[PDB]
């Protein structure tokens, strides 16, 4: 009484005030009212706790009873926690499109979502079209892209190409997007991005019986197992339609199938903090999966 809070979207900074009784749902609904977003089911709020870990805020719980890092103001990020199976069909509002575009671009540039060079150049090209508008020889003389972060670091290292040569390659594509509007340019970026192997998947350190280190992938379509040094190639898949239950205890996850005449799939995950997030992402991704097939 009263508690200053800052919530940041991808392109805005919001300043609110909360009371000791304010619930996660209340702060969340205020952000949504302020921003005018209706596709609320993809999003959540992130905070840093007193131990330093990034945590998703629980909505049906008081903000002051979640061990948010004590500072003036309290810091929050409004981000997408879930991703649609198809951007074209599910991202209706332009605000939803913009917020997704910006979050995905950031993850591609931070090398969190892998993207090969040619595709990265083409993606940068749409970002340039979205920011700059139509190519214009009079305004966009060589060097105009020098103060833009356009490519993932992974790309800038592997090649012999200079920064300026990369900017020429991106310019060349930008010229070809002539009459493309901002909204369409962001959607074209998203359509290409969503087909990337690492797009929309949450990766977690995992183990089998033998103790072999693997990756677990949680996404819109189901669960996937990856070998430790290849996050691009699913080795085993668990579609949501084939899953009855997911639970964990201490360090063991049990996935029960629909079939009932089929064996349980079990794996091991080290940290409780992480396992809670794994469980929550499964439930959410499973619920949204069903909704799309039962309107």
């Amino acid at each position: 009484k009263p508690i200053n809070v800052r919530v940041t979207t991808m392109d805005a900074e919001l300043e609110f005030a909360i009371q000791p009784n304010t619930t996660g749902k209340q702060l969340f609904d205020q952000v949504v009212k302020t921003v005018g977003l209706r596709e609320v089911w993809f999003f959540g709020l992130q905070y840093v706790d007193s131990k330093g870990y990034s945590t998703w805020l629980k909505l049906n719980k008081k903000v002051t009873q979640q061990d948010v890092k004590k500072e003036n103001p309290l810091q929050f990020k409004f981000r997408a926690k879930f991703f649609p199976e198809d951007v074209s069909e599910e991202l209706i509002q332009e605000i939803t499109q913009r917020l997704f575009f910006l979050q995905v671009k950031e993850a591609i540039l931070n090398d969190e979502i892998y993207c090969p060079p040619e595709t990265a150049v083409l993606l940068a090209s749409y970002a340039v079209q979205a920011k700059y508008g139509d190519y214009n020889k009079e305004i966009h003389k060589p060097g105009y892209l020098a103060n833009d972060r356009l490519l993932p670091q992974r790309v800038l290292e592997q090649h012999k190409l200079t920064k300026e040569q990369w900017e020429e390659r991106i310019q060349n594509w930008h010229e070809e997007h002539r009459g493309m509007l901002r909204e369409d340019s962001m959607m074209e970026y998203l359509k290409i991005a969503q087909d990337l192997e690492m797009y929309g998947v949450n990766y977690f350190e995992i183990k089998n019986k033998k103790g072999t280190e693997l990756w677990l992938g949680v996404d819109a379509l189901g669960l996937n197992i990856y070998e430790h040094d290849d996050k691009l190639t699913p080795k085993i898949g668990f579609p949501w339609s084939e899953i009855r239950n997911i639970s964990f205890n201490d360090k063991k996850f049990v996935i029960k199938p629909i079939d009932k005449k089929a064996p349980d799939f079990v794996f091991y995950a080290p940290r409780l903090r992480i396992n809670k997030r794994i469980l929550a992402l499964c439930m959410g991704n499973h619920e949204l999966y069903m909704r799309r097939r039962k309107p």
């Binding site: 089998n208 080795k235 079939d259």
Partner: peptide, 20 residues
Amino acid sequence: SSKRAPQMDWSKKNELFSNL
């Protein structure tokens, strides 16, 4: 086809997982 996991039943999933 998109980059999806190879098709198999749950017993085959467990066998493949268990010696990766």
